[PDB]
Ligand binder design. Sequence first.
Ligand SMILES: Nc1ncnc2c1ncn2[C@@H]1O[C@H](CSCC[C@H](N)C(=O)O)[C@@H](O)[C@H]1O
Length: 172
Amino acid sequence: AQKNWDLFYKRHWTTREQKLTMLEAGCGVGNCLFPLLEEDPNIFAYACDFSPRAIEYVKQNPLYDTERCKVFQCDLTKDDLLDHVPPESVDVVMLIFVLSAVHPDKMHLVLQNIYKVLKPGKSVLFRDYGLYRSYFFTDDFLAQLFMDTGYEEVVNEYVFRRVFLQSKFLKP
Ligand SMILES: Nc1ncnc2c1ncn2[C@@H]1O[C@H](CSCC[C@H](N)C(=O)O)[C@@H](O)[C@H]1O
């Protein structure tokens, strides 16, 4: 698994864009996130990625500042988010083009990990491929997955823009 994702380092925000605290799972090289962080200085981010070759690229980018963003390697499927992220401390979690890469059987080990750090009021902005080594999701299969892992859906919607899905789920 991670082997394939690490080989690649040798799927972008699309108008998805205060004391906001945010986590970007599968941050990547943080191409969209780092610009956002410069534009607003309030935002503190915890960026986590499966591949270490990606985390070094993230540190290399000039935009990277250590006091507006914390970057750490983590496999959400097995590694624990709480060890680097304080509990119920995040106002936004963004799963963008990342749940697809995770296997369906393990796909909820992440929604649960993200769940502990998410503040009870705050939600999880989602952006991923839909249908009607990634996998694609029908709008119902996905809403069930947050429901199975305890989150409550505010928005689930396919975008035609190969398909995309825009979904917002709120932790109770
Ligand atoms: N189980 C897993 N644990 C951690 N990161 C994972 C993962 N499965 C996929 N990823 C990460 O998912 C990311 C998706 S692509 C990068 C993010 C995208 N550019 C954005 O703007 O959000 C990759 O960086 C990959 O390493």
